Symmetry: C2
Subunit: 66 residues, 2 copies
Amino acid sequence: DCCLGYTDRILHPKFIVGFTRQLANEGCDINAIIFHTKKKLSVCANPKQTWVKYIVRLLCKKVKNM
Amino acid sequence: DCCLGYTDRILHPKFIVGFTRQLANEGCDINAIIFHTKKKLSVCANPKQTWVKYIVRLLCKKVKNM
């Protein structure tokens, strides 16, 4: 399914284990960052919000150093 | 469940839309990168492999530019 909107609350990175990018294309109507969480509830997030880019950067830096 | 090992099949970047990190101090025996695909299938991968780290960089750079 597609994100149709974005979460209204910052999600703490200690609960976040990954992300999936949703692109505006034939599949979905909007762009989104989908955060995957420890409790297996995925959370749609606004790619323009700074906290979203920051958490993505954090995840990316961790994998680089694994 | 936990990734108990790593795939040795091809990881085609065109079909990969996201990842999750599995860490060996969060309950599982080993670290893993779990790639998520458009078909909503997930694959366990070796976080130390250069190709794995490159797919993650691709996902991370795509997000940066969103």
